[PDB]
Amino acid sequence: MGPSLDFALSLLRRNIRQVQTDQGHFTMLGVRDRLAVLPRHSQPGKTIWVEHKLVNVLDAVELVDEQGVDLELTLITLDTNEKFRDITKFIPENISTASDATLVINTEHMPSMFVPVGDVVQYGFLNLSGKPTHRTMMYNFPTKAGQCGGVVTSVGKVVGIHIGGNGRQGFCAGLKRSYFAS
Numbered sequence: 383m384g385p386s387l388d389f390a391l392s393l394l395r396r397n398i399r400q401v402q403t404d405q406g407h408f409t410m411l412g413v414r415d416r417l418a419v420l421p422r423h424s425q426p427g428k429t430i431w432v433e434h435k436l437v438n439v440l441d442a443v444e445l446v447d448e449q450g451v452d453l454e455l456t457l458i459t460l461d462t463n464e465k466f467r468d469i470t471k472f473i474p475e476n477i478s479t480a481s482d483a484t485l486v487i488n489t490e491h492m493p494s495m496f497v498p499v500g501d502v503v504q505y506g507f508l509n510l511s512g513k514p515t516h517r518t519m520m521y522n523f524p525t526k527a528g529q530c531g532g533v534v535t536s537v538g539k540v541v542g543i544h545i546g547g548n549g550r551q552g553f554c555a556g557l558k559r560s561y562f563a564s
């Protein structure tokens with residue numbers, strides 16, 4: 383509710399970017415330095431649109447956890463002029479569920495949008511259009527196409543990235559701090 387909403391708003395300007403790839407429109411969380419995270423499904427190429435600018439991509443590396451499981455997110459590094467404000471400290475050391483979370487969407491079509499998704503609960507194994515992953519979490523909210531990459535936040539942590547849904551529920555890849563270690 384209110385507390386996750388205001389924390390979510392504090393991330394928006396400095397860290398939550400509108401992007402476009404050949405696959406469509408996505409929300410992108412910038413984490414530190416020139417490092418950001420996107421859904422694998424966005425399939426970033428050699429350039430990517432960020433806000434109004436076509437930006438060269440330094441690399442895109444699929445995020446695979448310490449158990450060898452693809453998390454369906456890719457870590458992208460960018461030929462941006464400025465570094466992102468470092469939000470490492472807001473990514474929890476442990477994958478975290480949360481009550482009354484906020485999902486932040488920021489795309490050209492859904493700009494600066496805060497979605498009260500309610501409680502985010504453990505889900506675990508998830509088969510997303512035939513691609514299996516784990517460590518996912520679920521919220522009973524009817525998320526939509528165009529919300530992938532959306533940032534799931536608690537009172538003061540960034541806990542997940544929206545990756546899929548079935549029309550009545552939504553699912554995020556869980557985040558923990560070690561995923562972003564250099």
Ligand SMILES: CCOC(=O)CC[C@H](C[C@@H]1CCNC1=O)NC(=O)[C@@H](CC(=O)[C@@H](NC(=O)c1cc(C)on1)C(C)C)Cc1ccc(F)cc1
Binds near residue numbers: 511513526528
């Ligand atoms: C570029 C445009 O594409 C997009 O908009 C990305 C947006 C949507 C957001 C969905 C869109 C709808 N409700 C939502 O919240 N995401 C996907 O579509 C994903 C597929 C699903 O959500 C599928 N769901 C399940 O499999 C699923 C399983 C359970 C359990 O619940 N849902 C549905 C398409 C059927 C794409 C994907 C494929 C393979 C993966 F490794 C990982 C992801």
